[PDB]
Amino acid sequence: FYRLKKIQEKKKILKEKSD
Amino acid sequence: RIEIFPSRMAQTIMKARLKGAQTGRNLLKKKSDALTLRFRQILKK
Amino acid sequence: STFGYVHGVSGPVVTACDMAGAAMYELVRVGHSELVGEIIRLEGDMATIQVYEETSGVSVGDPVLRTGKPLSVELGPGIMGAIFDGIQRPLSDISSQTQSIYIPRGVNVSALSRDVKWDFTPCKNLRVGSHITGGDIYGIVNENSLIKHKIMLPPRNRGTVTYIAPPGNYDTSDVVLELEFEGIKEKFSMVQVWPVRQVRPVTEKLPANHPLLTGQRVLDALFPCVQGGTTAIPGAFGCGKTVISQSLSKYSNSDVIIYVGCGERGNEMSEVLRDFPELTMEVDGKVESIMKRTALVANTSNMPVAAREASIYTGITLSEYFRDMGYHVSMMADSTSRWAEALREISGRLAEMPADSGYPAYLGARLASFYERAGRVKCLGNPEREGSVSIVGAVSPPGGDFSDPVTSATLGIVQVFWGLDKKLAQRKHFPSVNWLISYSKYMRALDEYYDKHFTEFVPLRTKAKEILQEEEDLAEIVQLVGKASLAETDKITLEVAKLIKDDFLQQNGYTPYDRFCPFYKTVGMLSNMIAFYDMARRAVETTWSIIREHMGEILYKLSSMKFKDPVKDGEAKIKADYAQLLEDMQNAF
Amino acid sequence: NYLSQPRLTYKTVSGVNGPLVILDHVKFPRYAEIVHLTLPDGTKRSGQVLEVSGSKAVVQVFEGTSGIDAKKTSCEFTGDILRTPVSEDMLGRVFNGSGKPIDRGPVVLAEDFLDIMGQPINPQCRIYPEEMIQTGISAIDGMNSIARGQKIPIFSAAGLPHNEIAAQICRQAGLVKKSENFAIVFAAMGVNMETARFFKSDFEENGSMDNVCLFLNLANDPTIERIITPRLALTTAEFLAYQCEKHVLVILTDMSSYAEALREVSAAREEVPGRRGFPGYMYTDLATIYERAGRVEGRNGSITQIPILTMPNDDITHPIPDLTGYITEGQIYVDRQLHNRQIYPPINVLPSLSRLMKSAIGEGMTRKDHADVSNQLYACYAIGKDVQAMKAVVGEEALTSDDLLYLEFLQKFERNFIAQGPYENRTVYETLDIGWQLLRIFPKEMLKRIPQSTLSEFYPR
Amino acid sequence: NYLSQPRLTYKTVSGVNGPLVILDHVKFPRYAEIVHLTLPDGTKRSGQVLEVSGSKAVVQVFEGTSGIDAKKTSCEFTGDILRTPVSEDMLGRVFNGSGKPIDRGPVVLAEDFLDIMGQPINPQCRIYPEEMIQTGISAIDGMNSIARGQKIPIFSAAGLPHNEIAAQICRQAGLVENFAIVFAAMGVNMETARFFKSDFEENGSMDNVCLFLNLANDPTIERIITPRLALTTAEFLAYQCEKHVLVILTDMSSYAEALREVSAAREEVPGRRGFPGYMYTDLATIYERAGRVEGRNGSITQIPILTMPNDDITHPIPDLTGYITEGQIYVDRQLHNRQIYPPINVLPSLSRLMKSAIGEGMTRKDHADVSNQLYACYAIGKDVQAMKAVVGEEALTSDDLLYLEFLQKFERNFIAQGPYENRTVYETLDIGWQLLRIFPKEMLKRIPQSTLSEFYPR
Amino acid sequence: EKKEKQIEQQKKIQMSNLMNQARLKVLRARDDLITDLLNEAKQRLSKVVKDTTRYQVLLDGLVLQGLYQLLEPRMIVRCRKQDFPLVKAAVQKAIPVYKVATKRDVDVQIDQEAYLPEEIAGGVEIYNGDRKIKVSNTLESRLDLIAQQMMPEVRGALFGANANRK
Amino acid sequence: QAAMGSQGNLSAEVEQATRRQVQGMQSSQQRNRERVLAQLLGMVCDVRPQVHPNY
């Protein structure tokens, strides 16, 4: 659960750059 | 006192090993009761 | 501003924009049908809202109507006999306004109806110009024949009375009191709105001294509960749960009852909602229905998961508003195990970290911050009243195992545990309260009441406890070696233990003589059964046979004691008959 | 409440990733909107909008995403959420999981347009279930009897005949004769081609299709249609029951293949998987299709559910039969022990239980000895299974004359009462009469659970 | 030395979720800085800056973010880290979790301001604890004796009388001129707060007791700073006013359960059972603040009470406590159902500093040897009791019946003493020598023949 | 033995609560000697507002102390009604000395639409251009910051020092 | 005897020891008051405008 929520926090940041 | 590694198939192996010993008492409680029933009527005889 | 727009919905969660002055955990109304939701994040101008209802057909740009309050109850007249859900929508009014069987997903129907008229009368001390603090009773509404609804001030505000209402009939929308303060004059009606997560302020916590006369004989004697205490019971399929929940509503000294069914079931809640309107209360005059002093919070699991998680806080806030009037409230949460399954879905939707067995990190702290809202306290307000809240929270553990993040965290917070057993229901022992696994930690605070009122009860029950604790170690040897090697001292205490489990503890609830056994009957039915024990303790120190065959009629007089009906039999007769049995035992020995 | 605005068609697809198609420049998109994709080579596909954000709307296509371009495909927004064409002439028709007819028939004429999500029933309007639903199986009607509104699963495993006794209790379900407005909505989720062909050709070849509304959903069907399959089946069962006032039985077979489709779309919305891979909201999602049951106050209709599920590895601590036992009201075990012994149906009644069977049976409902012959057949079954463990370690000689009578009861209980055969329709009266032929081999005063007020009328024959 | 610049007051909140408020445009934010929120409805809340990044400051509030606006709330940055007003007059008063008085009193007049996080003592100037505290309990003063400067928990469970033996070791706390007791209550009930408050006034001890009580309905982020407040006044009394302090941190499982919710809100890396990865270092910042130093005549002893979940010593609450502290006191559930008042199972109990605090000059010569034999005769007879339940009550060796004669005479006579009896260490060793009289002289292997000749014939 | 023990346990609690109220009474009387001393420091601070030469040399640095902490491009000074010609020289003295220490340039004005309340003894509150960030540099706020940090000094000098230290 | 003698212990403390503690520090406040207020108001009027050390 901690490894998957770490990735979904990282994928959100990369989708905040490409806006 | 533990035995082996938790692997989600050791949970269903040990639930069967628990199932063997749960029915190992109830099969041997009545064997020790059949021996006790004859022991309490031989003593009357 | 007052409106926000939706800007995107991704399931139950709406990220509403244009909401700058929005607060955290503040209720809004999303959409054209005004679905209720609460603000759960706040990123600049956008507010991330999770909707209680089902989002379906909510467009981008629908209005989000801000209210400005958290989840809060409306406290006023029209609450006794009403059935709410966990977020206080009137189920008895939704089925009457809409003439259907469904909840129409967009009903902001008011919890207390503003069409009924209530006979208001002031406190007769307050005049125009009196200074008034928070919690002061300024009126009384005669709501029913049983309950006088004392209209109080909110604990927030304060001021000076400049307009009181004349005695007459008003709605819940008519202005009744008007208060000048420093800046602006405030005016407010008979209803007050209090947030359910906020603990009600009070003057001083008092220690709990007075017991709850539940009516049962095992519970009033062996494991006593106090009014202002927290208990717990196992919530299995059938042990005794239907009669402990209904004798405590019929046969208790508590003034109002709140019953919180918290996400129970479809048919197990429709059974409760049709059995409580048909219960009967024996007040000193004629018979009355129990719904003149009882409110219900009914939730099935088809209802929203946040209207199942906040059902406990709705029930304890109705229990605390009727505490501050001066009444002695008793609240039964019907299941707290189904409440913690509503926390796991709320935390599992927010992607919270699981602590233990999936439950969130704040499970043990949210259970403690609810059970510590119960207690006999001295209320706010210059009329100088006192109130109480008793909490009976049932726990349904998985598989009947007492090791669980909810069950093991309940037994560390509650003081009393009435352990109902499945095996005693299969042997028709009613009520099925086990005596070994049960306990009670209010005995040290209950001696000061027992030494001023009964004074021969405290050493009475400790003798009755060591008899039954002796029986369990004697039960393994009666099948091992048998009664042929059993001692003359030990075979008599086994035979009075069978007299204890048949005469004192076992109590049939449908018989008209044992529906409400008062404590004068309870102290009598044990003082003649422990005095029989120690006079049988010196009778073996001087024959076990001749006391069983010659005193067989005296064995019948103790085994027809529970029959000494106290409804139609006077108290002084029962005391008189019980003294006559005491002389028969002292003369036969 | 008609809407008459013309629909918009967008060619503004701006991203495809898995079964999701991301659109852009959408004018006020609804949340659960039904759209209609049009492929560049003319093939039509449907889809639900999954998540909107400003002018961007993310649809997920039902039939799959292969071949979907970003330049030539066109998506058309039907301005409302998914509806159901309901009627009373959907009794005898076979539909697929999305509502289209399968049995070479026409479309339904739609006497109402209802929502698949529905609304929750008012707890103040629901009433307690009283009478009985006759299933025709003696192990179910006799000892684990179901009420009119009871929710009771069938806990089975993979390989056990839970599809063969699902089709049995659909062909021969009735109320009770009692000497009347009965319908059945059968929803199949995640079945094979062989099981779907068996369900189609067993109901139409037995005369039962005058009152059966059959919803197939194969395993080669879209996995989003497994979610709207119990929502279609319970929308029509809320139209037949307490809107047309007929008692409806809903058989939701393979409820373990529904929650494998719920787990699939929970990973399409980029959610973190909860306990054992299943989502965290599965208790709410399972209870939104179980709690559409029970009777209401002012209407004569009723709806009872038998959600059949397969627990994996014979586990009760799995989240599929544990979150079902919390909301449903007693279970029925199909077990591997009696199935290898060649007993049909292989329903062991020792762990099975119906929590509302004390309400279902009675004097005015079936007849007044049902409460005692069910308790006595269950008590004599536990003893006859206990003394059968004594027959191997003690001996056939040393056991008494009482324990030799329980062993002759055991070989007749599991062969005449439970063992029935797939085409023997026993009534509730023929079940109890077999229940007395197995109690008559004992003398009375061993029948201690039966009172003498009912032992005198039914024992001597 | 002192701050003289005015305080900046921001209305520039830009994000709030959970207990964390995120401000923007903060000019030079400071780590671990205290801010003062004022809500739009007028109530005040405190906070602590937990992470800065450029011009942002991630402050968590101590009372929860329920009602915090994004436009109307105002946040005032106090330019310093959390210091508390400490004084000698904080002795005889009760306080809540944050800082405030409860007993209708005034604020503290601040002899000086101490940082609540402290600073660790130099291990070269930290001297070993030597003087044994005679606490009047035979299971402690016999076999698990504490020193003056020792950290030693009471490993308890739910429902066991760990509050009662906490108030019992407060009255009888003396040497083999009173202890200035500092009491910290975190996550306790109402009755548990009244049980400790009315006991410290019963024995007249509330002239030197500073109660820091934080109830169960108090906020769960104020439970973090509750042991830090009660140990920064205990360092003021012991390391500056030369006073011998007895610190009791009751319900330490309510501290670390309140530590799990804060770290799970920050999405920190979890250790075992959800507790954060820094649980060892966060527990040791309040456990290692004990002992005595070379330049001072004061000392600080910690007795932190904790209830282990499910009677398990391998839970992360009592497991990580044994690695920091110097031995534990283990009360038992099996000895509580038999109505022994101190249910102290001595087998998983330990005192790591008892070897230096007993002996010839300390108590007497026979102390180190009778405690090794009372421990071994107890451990063998529990192995014998686990053997007779499988084998039988009659198929034992005749030497194995003395080990059943020992345990039934051990638990009722040695450790069971009553709630107001304070046995001295010379009373205890003459009771402990009686139980070894039922064994032969050459079955006591741990005691040599020299001190057997002086004590065993009696 | 139950009548004598329950009386003596309550007789001790009766005496212990008497000395408990005695300890809080001398502590509450000590707090009143700090309250009126703080009240006397507030009345003597208003006499510095009375004369004009000592107040404007205070208010010269009092506005510059708030200007040095905000460091904004555009700041807004908010004062009382009576002191508006007195801050106009305090602002204009502070513009050419802000640009010597720093190296940016200001757009300082004075808020005329909303003045400070008349209960304020004196001083100045200075905002930023967006009116979000605020510096409360009044004489009521300087007395709160200084006299709470100096409580170790106004206890040891104004009452007796402690006999046990370090 | 315990109820009558407990009242004699009240006036030996509630007006003897308590009332001498208030005037014992009322005199010590009046001796050192004007030195404190000259030190206190010296710090309120000695405004030293600085910038942050991080400029």
Side-chain angles (χ1 to χ4, degrees), chain C residues 432-485:
Chain C
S432 300
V433 172
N434 203 328
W435 43 84
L436 161 77
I437 59 171
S438 177
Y439 59 93
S440 159
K441 295 175 191 164
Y442 277 125
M443 291 168 186
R444 320 298 169 192
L446 257 178
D447 48 18
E448 194 260 9
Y449 170 80
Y450 283 158
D451 300 347
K452 297 227 305 177
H453 283 67
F454 289 91
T455 327
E456 71 266 337
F457 176 64
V458 178
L460 207 48
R461 56 175 173 85
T462 73
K463 183 61 69 179
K465 283 205 170 197
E466 262 55 44
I467 289 163
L468 302 156
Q469 201 74 270
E470 182 270 315
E471 199 180 34
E472 68 86 19
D473 56 86
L474 213 70
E476 59 200 278
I477 70 173
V478 71
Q479 45 93 27
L480 178 84
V481 55
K483 301 182 66 162
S485 76

Side-chain angles (χ1 to χ4, degrees), chain D residues 307-451:
Chain D
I308 298 164
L309 62 95
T310 81
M311 38 163 67
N313 215 357
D314 293 328
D315 201 328
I316 198 161
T317 73
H318 198 244
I320 309 301
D322 188 22
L323 301 179
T324 313
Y326 279 179
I327 178 58
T328 66
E329 292 162 352
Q331 64 271 358
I332 291 174
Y333 283 100
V334 177
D335 68 323
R336 209 179 307 271
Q337 169 76 38
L338 308 183
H339 176 55
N340 299 323
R341 197 175 154 85
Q342 310 299 314
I343 298 172
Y344 185 81
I347 297 176
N348 51 338
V349 304
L350 290 155
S352 312
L353 172 84
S354 191
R355 296 193 201 278
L356 316 182
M357 85 166 294
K358 69 176 180 66
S359 307
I361 64 178
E363 184 162 344
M365 299 153 171
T366 78
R367 63 184 217 196
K368 68 170 185 317
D369 76 289
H370 206 154
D372 314 328
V373 77
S374 158
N375 288 323
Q376 194 44 67
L377 276 166
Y378 179 70
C380 291
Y381 195 38
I383 299 174
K385 196 62 81 156
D386 170 81
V387 304
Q388 201 264 334
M390 292 204 68
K391 209 210 161 184
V393 307
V394 177
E396 78 266 18
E397 291 215 349
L399 56 89
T400 174
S401 48
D402 279 1
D403 301 14
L404 206 46
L405 209 58
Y406 287 102
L407 289 180
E408 201 260 328
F409 166 74
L410 184 73
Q411 213 166 340
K412 292 196 73 62
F413 183 70
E414 296 178 334
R415 288 297 156 175
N416 298 317
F417 196 82
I418 289 174
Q420 172 166 327
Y423 287 87
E424 177 176 332
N425 182 19
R426 298 189 192 154
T427 71
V428 74
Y429 302 115
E430 300 184 33
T431 292
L432 301 186
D433 293 349
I434 298 171
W436 279 111
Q437 293 169 195
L438 311 169
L439 286 187
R440 268 159 201 158
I441 72 173
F442 296 93
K444 41 189 198 308
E445 304 85 54
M446 297 191 198
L447 271 58
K448 297 183 292 296
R449 262 78 203 175
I450 312 184

Side-chain angles (χ1 to χ4, degrees), chain E residues 45-193:
Chain E
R45 282 175 191 175
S46 285
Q48 195 172 35
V49 175
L50 271 196
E51 164 183 6
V52 309
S53 292
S55 83
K56 325 188 77 166
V58 185
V59 53
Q60 66 160 11
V61 295
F62 287 149
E63 288 84 8
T65 53
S66 178
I68 286 185
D69 211 334
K71 188 166 77 181
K72 281 180 150 194
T73 186
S74 178
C75 169
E76 165 171 325
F77 269 64
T78 290
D80 207 17
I81 76 180
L82 191 39
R83 317 195 174 273
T84 44
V86 70
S87 177
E88 185 68 27
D89 283 288
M90 300 181 67
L91 206 58
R93 316 195 46 192
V94 309
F95 298 91
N96 68 338
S98 44
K100 313 305 168 211
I102 288 299
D103 51 335
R104 312 183 177 202
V107 285
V108 180
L109 207 70
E111 289 199 4
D112 56 345
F113 289 89
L114 261 72
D115 184 27
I116 72 158
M117 287 296 166
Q119 36 193 356
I121 321 172
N122 198 352
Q124 206 268 345
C125 74
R126 180 204 279 259
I127 65 171
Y128 212 56
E130 286 305 327
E131 314 211 50
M132 158 174 168
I133 292 166
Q134 171 184 272
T135 188
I137 296 183
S138 194
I140 312 300
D141 289 350
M143 325 185 65
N144 303 292
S145 50
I146 74 171
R148 185 186 251 175
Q150 177 175 329
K151 53 194 93 69
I152 169 162
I154 299 175
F155 277 179
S156 180
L160 301 187
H162 48 280
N163 299 316
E164 284 80 350
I165 77 168
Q168 198 192 10
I169 62 180
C170 275
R171 314 182 277 252
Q172 324 168 356
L175 280 195
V176 66
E177 52 261 57
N178 261 356
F179 276 167
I181 294 172
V182 180
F183 202 91
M186 54 208 81
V188 286
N189 317 337
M190 180 48 72
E191 173 267 359
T192 313

Side-chain angles (χ1 to χ4, degrees), chain C residues 6-12 15 53-61 83 89-96 98-105 237-238 263-271 273-274 298-305 308 338 341-342 344-345 348-349 351 357-359 396-399 426, chain D residues 28-33 50-55 81 115 117-129 149-151 238 241-243 269 271-272 275 280-285 287-299 322-330 353-356 358 449:
Chain C
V6 166
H7 202 283
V9 47
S10 158
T15 74
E53 305 286 330
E54 165 85 41
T55 52
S56 201
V58 172
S59 307
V60 167
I83 311 166
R89 313 183 282 198
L91 297 188
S92 43
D93 304 351
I94 282 176
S95 67
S96 161
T98 73
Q99 281 288 299
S100 88
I101 47 174
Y102 307 112
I103 310 181
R105 274 172 55 181
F237 161 63
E264 261 286 355
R265 254 166 186 165
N267 306 117
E268 213 177 20
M269 204 67 214
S270 88
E271 166 196 66
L273 291 199
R274 78 142 170 84
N299 283 288
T300 74
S301 69
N302 218 322
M303 309 213 60
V305 79
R308 272 146 46 202
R338 304 289 171 266
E341 276 201 306
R344 185 160 56 178
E345 299 181 271
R349 196 183 303 276
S357 158
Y359 291 107
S396 165
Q426 307 165 12
Chain D
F28 303 124
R30 282 208 168 184
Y31 167 65
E33 215 170 355
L50 192 72
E51 154 181 1
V52 298
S53 174
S55 44
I81 65 178
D115 197 6
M117 285 307 161
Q119 286 140 351
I121 316 186
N122 211 330
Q124 202 263 336
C125 272
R126 206 190 306 243
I127 210 165
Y128 207 65
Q150 186 176 359
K151 307 168 281 288
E238 282 175 346
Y242 40 77
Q243 206 162 310
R269 309 153 64 109
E271 289 170 356
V272 192
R275 194 174 69 251
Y281 54 90
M282 201 177 67
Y283 178 75
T284 316
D285 191 290
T288 41
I289 74 183
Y290 291 156
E291 291 276 88
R292 305 168 90 166
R295 315 195 293 118
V296 288
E297 50 176 3
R299 295 182 181 91
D322 188 22
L323 301 179
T324 313
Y326 279 179
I327 178 58
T328 66
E329 292 162 352
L353 172 84
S354 191
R355 296 193 201 278
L356 316 182
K358 69 176 180 66
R449 262 78 203 175

